Design an enzyme around this catalytic site. Structure first.
Site, PDB file in Angstrom:
ATOM      1  N   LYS B  18       0.886  -1.158   0.000  1.00 45.64           N
ATOM      2  CA  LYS B  18       0.000   0.000   0.000  1.00 45.64           C
ATOM      3  C   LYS B  18       0.926   1.211   0.000  1.00 45.64           C
ATOM      4  O   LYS B  18       1.786   1.326   0.873  1.00 45.64           O
ATOM      5  CB  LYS B  18      -0.869   0.008   1.262  1.00 45.64           C
ATOM      6  CG  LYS B  18      -1.561   1.345   1.530  1.00 45.64           C
ATOM      7  CD  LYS B  18      -2.529   1.281   2.701  1.00 45.64           C
ATOM      8  CE  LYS B  18      -3.764   0.458   2.364  1.00 45.64           C
ATOM      9  NZ  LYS B  18      -4.817   0.540   3.430  1.00 45.64           N
ATOM     10  N   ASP B 115     -15.424   0.090  11.005  1.00 47.43           N
ATOM     11  CA  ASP B 115     -15.826  -0.012   9.617  1.00 47.43           C
ATOM     12  C   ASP B 115     -15.773  -1.423   9.084  1.00 47.43           C
ATOM     13  O   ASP B 115     -15.134  -1.686   8.067  1.00 47.43           O
ATOM     14  CB  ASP B 115     -14.990   0.921   8.740  1.00 47.43           C
ATOM     15  CG  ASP B 115     -15.619   1.154   7.355  1.00 47.43           C
ATOM     16  OD1 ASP B 115     -16.878   1.232   7.256  1.00 47.43           O
ATOM     17  OD2 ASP B 115     -14.847   1.274   6.370  1.00 47.43           O
TER      18      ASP B 115
HETATM   19  N1  LIG Z   1      -3.468  -7.436   1.742  1.00 51.13           N
HETATM   20  C1  LIG Z   1      -4.024  -7.262   0.483  1.00 51.13           C
HETATM   21  N2  LIG Z   1      -4.180  -8.319  -0.330  1.00 51.13           N
HETATM   22  C2  LIG Z   1      -4.706  -8.210  -1.552  1.00 51.13           C
HETATM   23  N3  LIG Z   1      -5.104  -7.023  -1.995  1.00 51.13           N
HETATM   24  C3  LIG Z   1      -4.995  -5.905  -1.266  1.00 51.13           C
HETATM   25  C4  LIG Z   1      -4.432  -5.978   0.032  1.00 51.13           C
HETATM   26  N4  LIG Z   1      -4.435  -4.726   0.530  1.00 51.13           N
HETATM   27  C5  LIG Z   1      -4.953  -3.936  -0.359  1.00 51.13           C
HETATM   28  N5  LIG Z   1      -5.335  -4.595  -1.493  1.00 51.13           N
HETATM   29  C6  LIG Z   1      -5.974  -4.007  -2.696  1.00 51.13           C
HETATM   30  O1  LIG Z   1      -6.216  -2.576  -2.535  1.00 51.13           O
HETATM   31  C7  LIG Z   1      -7.630  -2.276  -2.644  1.00 51.13           C
HETATM   32  C8  LIG Z   1      -8.206  -1.023  -1.955  1.00 51.13           C
HETATM   33  O2  LIG Z   1      -7.307  -0.207  -1.193  1.00 51.13           O
HETATM   34  P1  LIG Z   1      -7.613  -0.338   0.395  1.00 51.13           P
HETATM   35  O3  LIG Z   1      -6.598  -1.267   0.928  1.00 51.13           O
HETATM   36  O4  LIG Z   1      -8.987  -1.094   0.782  1.00 51.13           O
HETATM   37  O5  LIG Z   1      -7.344   1.083   1.148  1.00 51.13           O
HETATM   38  P2  LIG Z   1      -8.400   1.826   2.143  1.00 51.13           P
HETATM   39  O6  LIG Z   1      -8.928   3.001   1.413  1.00 51.13           O
HETATM   40  O7  LIG Z   1      -7.650   2.448   3.434  1.00 51.13           O
HETATM   41  O8  LIG Z   1      -9.594   0.880   2.698  1.00 51.13           O
HETATM   42  P3  LIG Z   1     -10.994   0.763   1.886  1.00 51.13           P
HETATM   43  O9  LIG Z   1     -12.103   1.695   2.596  1.00 51.13           O
HETATM   44  O10 LIG Z   1     -11.451  -0.779   1.999  1.00 51.13           O
HETATM   45  S1  LIG Z   1     -10.897   1.184   0.067  1.00 51.13           S
HETATM   46  C9  LIG Z   1      -8.344  -3.619  -2.340  1.00 51.13           C
HETATM   47  O11 LIG Z   1      -8.595  -3.891  -0.950  1.00 51.13           O
HETATM   48  C10 LIG Z   1      -7.358  -4.648  -2.949  1.00 51.13           C
HETATM   49  O12 LIG Z   1      -7.579  -4.880  -4.346  1.00 51.13           O
END
Ligand SMILES: Nc1ncnc2c1ncn2[C@@H]1O[C@H](COP(=O)(O)OP(=O)(O)OP(O)(O)=S)[C@H](O)[C@H]1O
Lengths: 213, 284
Positions: B18, B115
């Protein structure tokens, strides 16, 4: 002859102004003693700012509505940085810059209501970029271990980058309040320490804070 | 925040990268600070592990244990073309078991997720479920003034929270678990609201309206409606059952009701939940 306010056992039900005083007092006390005794840190200013510590605190406190816990945490963040950043030493040459950073980080990482760095920078009296790096730095030297919990400092110490030695050295379950006793611990501590009108920032608020036995 | 797939060089073990860029009017994203911060505090088997952080110039990358898909993705796969379809009940009790386990952990450390939803529940090829995205979470061990925040969906939001509450505790997460559950059983959202107004209605439609006698504090709720069209509770069985191909036994129901109360204080705790007769077989 001086007033004699009696504080609440809960720093939350206590005057944000009264805290800043108790904290500021403690803060110039550590500055006195630490100077009573070289390599610069991001928190170093070229010379002691003219504005007193207290006059700088309320301002940050008022125009950024910093919450109580954030106030305490800031102080606690001193014992945390002094322990895991050898170069960093609280003295009347780092205090302000530290306080700005400390305070704006306790807020963002721990609170629901929080501003932007640029806002903080403006109230604090510095360029946003100045505050950015000033915040990035502190966060690195602590490994984002900003949650004031009983074993935080230690874990932080450990988690530090460790010098390999020839000879080796050396859970919150059951722990009261699950290990969240730091902020109170300090609250009580400051009243016991700089509680009376005998520190140095006498000039500020002429008050004697007595915390219920 | 943009993420990518990657893998240890020293170790072949894959991960998730990330990426949170640095330098801005807000400098280091409070969300990152909050996430990174709490993750070091949450080492458990049902809570995605944060391997490490890679600061550098104006870019920060958090390295999470790479997980395959999620409760959401997982189910679509199953019946993306065959409309809503729940999961095999043994499988519904298993995933629910892991979710309360990891959450139970969070609450013990005095941390609320705030959440919870299908997509925030990562799964790996080994079938292991783990809690994710702690970006909106918070350490309630720190008595600051609470303020709910904006989420993209309100399908898992507690009624009282939707009614302006700012004094909720761990109870907020339990409700979500109730919803998550019902969805895993029936295959579709139990409250497909489209806004705070809509959602509250749908919740009240099946749960009935708040009972000022079993939930006196509701009058204190800022968005409370003293004179709203009262309704009785519709009964759960006749709402779900018709969309699930397995006899919803007694326990599951009782359990389901214990997580879906309107009155927070009446909602079961993750600890209590884990000891509900519905999970007896996992013991002894
Ligand atoms: N550990 C992981 N394994 C696989 N895909 C991931 C992982 N972490 C993030 N992703 C990808 O990144 C995407 C979205 O970014 P998010 O990690 O969810 O950031 P975030 O905005 O803080 O949380 P939200 O509210 O769920 S979008 C999807 O979750 C996945 O396609």
């Amino acid at each position: 002859g001086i007033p004699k306010v009696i504080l609440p056992a809960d720093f939350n039900k206590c005057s944000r102004t009264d805290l800043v005083v108790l904290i500021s007092r403690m803060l110039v006390s550590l500055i006195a003693i630490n100077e009573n005794s070289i390599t610069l840190t991001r928190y170093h200013s070229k010379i002691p700012p003219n504005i007193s510590i207290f006059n700088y605190f309320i301002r940050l406190t008022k125009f950024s509505s910093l919450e109580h816990c954030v106030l305490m945490t800031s102080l606690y963040y001193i014992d945390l940085l002094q322990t895991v950043y050898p170069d960093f030493t609280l003295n009347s040459l780092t205090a302000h810059r530290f306080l700005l950073t400390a305070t704006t980080v306790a807020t963002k990482g721990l609170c629901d209501s929080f501003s932007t760095n640029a806002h903080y920078a403006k109230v604090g009296g510095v360029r946003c970029h100045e505050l950015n790096i000033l915040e990035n730095d502190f966060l690195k030297r602590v490994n984002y271990r900003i949650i004031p919990r009983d074993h935080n400092i230690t874990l932080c110490s450990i988690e530090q980058k460790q010098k390999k030695f020839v000879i080796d050295k050396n859970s919150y379950v059951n722990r009261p309040k699950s290990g969240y006793n730091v902020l109170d611990k300090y609250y009580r501590r400051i009243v016991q320490l700089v509680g009376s009108f005998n520190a140095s920032p006498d000039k500020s608020r002429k008050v004697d804070y007595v915390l219920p036995p | 925040a943009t993420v990518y797939k990657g893998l240890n060089k020293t170790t072949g073990v894959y991960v998730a990268l990330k990426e949170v860029k640095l330098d801005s009017e807000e400098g280091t994203p409070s969300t990152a600070i909050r996430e990174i911060s709490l993750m070091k505090e949450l080492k458990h088997e049902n809570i995605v592990r944060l391997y490490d952080v890679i600061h550098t110039e104006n870019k920060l990358t958090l390295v999470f244990e790479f997980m395959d898909n999620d409760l959401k993705k997982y189910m679509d796969s199953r019946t993306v073309g065959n409309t809503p379809r729940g999961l095999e009940l043994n499988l519904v009790k298993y995933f629910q078991w892991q979710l309360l386990q990891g959450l139970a952990f969070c609450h013990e450390n005095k941390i609320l997720h705030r959440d919870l939803k299908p997509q925030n529940l990562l799964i790996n090829k080994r079938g292991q479920l783990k809690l994710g995205d702690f970006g909106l979470a918070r350490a309630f061990g720190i008595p600051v003034n609470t303020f709910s925040s904006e989420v993209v969906t309100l399908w898992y939001r507690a009624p009282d929270v939707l009614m302006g509450s700012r004094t909720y505790s761990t109870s907020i997460d339990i409700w979500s678990c109730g919803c998550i559950l019902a969805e895993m059983i029936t295959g579709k959202p139990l409250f497909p609201g489209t806004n705070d107004e809509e959602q509250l209605k749908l919740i009240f439609d099946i749960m009935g309206t708040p009972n000022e006698s079993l939930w006196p504090s509701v009058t204190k709720l800022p968005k409370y409606n003293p004179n709203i069209q009262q309704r009785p509770p519709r009964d759960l069985r006749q709402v779900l059952q018709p969309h699930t191909k397995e006899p919803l036994d007694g326990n599951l129901m009782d359990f389901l009701h214990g997580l879906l109360q309107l009155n927070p204080d009446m909602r079961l705790s993750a600890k209590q939940a884990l000891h509900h007769p519905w999970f007896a077989e996992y013991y002894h």
